[PDB]
Each structure stands twice: as structure tokens, then as C-alpha cells.
A = this chain, B = another copy of it.
Amino acid sequence: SAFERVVRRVVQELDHGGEFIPVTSLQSSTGFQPYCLVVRKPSSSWFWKPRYKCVNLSIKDILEPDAAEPDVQRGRSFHFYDAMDGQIQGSVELAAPGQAKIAGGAAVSDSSSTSMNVYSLSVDPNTWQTLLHERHLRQPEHKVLQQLRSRGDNVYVVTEVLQTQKEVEVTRTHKREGSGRFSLPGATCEQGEGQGHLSQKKTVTIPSGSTLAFRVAQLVIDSDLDVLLFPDKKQRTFQ
């Protein structure tokens, strides 16, 4: 996919530290911003993980007096680089288990590269409490929520983002080579050959300011809005 590899590497460069739910969609990378809303259904049994659905909706219009007040203050610059290559092959000279004198082989080769820079933007809980206490919910707003209420899915907000700030790119390659030479005096053939190789590569480029991972903070809607920073499981937003 040329994207899950690098984002998985970036998250693994933290030794599974912090939640930082990684992103998969090129279209949803841009939609994951601070104060954004996401919608997730309850899990099926234990392991059918309900994947996160990004909703391009902020909290400013949900509240009445048109907030439009981002409070991003965190910022740092981690530079990262790596590479990779390999070569796997094999050969067999088989004559006993049949009527053949098989002379075949194979070879697999590939590579990779990556280099980026990284911020980390957050939102302070004090900003959340100021926003909640000063300003309230526009309760006659369900044209985006009434159907969402019928679904009843818990709605979360984005409290953490990790984005890249440079002309970042990734380059991959691939080489798959097959071979075969069969000299089999039998019933259907006497001599035959089979081989085929294909090369392949690509190049993907990410623009500056693209979210790579995020963290959520569940909220509850029974009569009014309230954000639970570290809630428990089976915390139903609606009734």
C-alpha cells in the first residue's frame, strides 16, 4: 500500500508508547485536525476493532457563539531517516521424486527509503474547561446528529495530532524473478521450460502538515455536552 509501511514504522519508532491511533486513508489524513469530530461504533465481540471514521466537523459550529479559537501551542522537531534492502533466492536440482530433471530457480529483491520531520500539537485541558464553562451547546442542532443519535455511536474529539513539515517522500522497488527447466520424459510432456520476471517500483509524496496519528477524548450527550478526557469502556454517549 506504500503508506501503511511507513506509518507503522513511525508508530513503532515509539516502542508502542502512547495510543496515537495511526491513520490509513490519504483523504482522512487531512481531515484529522484538532477540535475535529470522529465517529466510532461499539466493538463487535472482542477483536473486530471498529475502525475510526473521520467526520469533517469541528466543535465551533456545534456551540452557539462561533468559537473559531484554536489553542495549539505545542511544537517540536524530530528528524528521522532510514533505509532497507534484501535479496532472497533459491535453486533446486531435482531428479528422484518423479520422471523429471528439474533445473529451476527464483530471486526476490526490494528496497525502501524514508525521511521526514515531525511536530506534535495538543490541546490543554484548561482550554477545554474554559470552553465548556464559558459557552454551551446549541441544543436545536441535530441535522448532523439526529441520524447519528439513531445510530447512537459514541462521538469523540481530537486532542492530539502528529504531522510532517517538509517535502517528504517515500520510494520503493521490487524484483521478482522466476525460472524453470524441466526435462521430464513422461506421459504428457518430454521437455519444457517456464520462467517469468517482473520489476516494479513507485514514488509517493506527502505534503507538509499531514496528520499521521491522533488521540481522542470521548464526550457524552444526554442533555448537554461534557468531555471525559480518560473515560471507561462501555461509556455510551447517548441514552
Contacts and interface: CB of A to CB of B under 8 A. Distances in A.
A147 B14 contact: no
B17 A13 contact: no
Given A90-B194, A191-B92, A56 B13 contact: no
Interface in A79-123: 79-97, 120, 122
Given A15-B4, A205-B79, A147 B231 contact: yes
A197 B125 contact: no
A25 interface: yes
Interface in A140-196: 141, 143-144, 147-148, 150-151, 160, 162, 167, 169, 185-196
Contacts of A185: 96
A12 interface: yes
B210 A76 contact: yes
Contacts of A191: 91-94
A139 interface: no
A194 to B, nearest CB: 5
A18 interface: yes
A103 to B, nearest CB: 10
A200 interface: yes
User: How many copies of this chain?
Assistant: 4
A61 interface: yes
A230 B128 CA distance: 28
A227 B143 CA distance: 8
Contacts of A78: 26, 204-207
Interface of A: 1-4, 12-15, 17-18, 20, 24-28, 30-31, 39, 55-57, 61, 74, 76-97, 120, 122, 124-126, 128-129, 132-133, 141, 143-144, 147-148, 150-151, 160, 162, 167, 169, 185-207, 210, 226-232
Ordered nearest first, which 10 A-B pairs have the shortest CB separation?
A17-B25, A88-B196, A86-B198, A93-B191, A1-B15, A82-B202, A81-B203, A91-B193, A79-B205, A85-B199
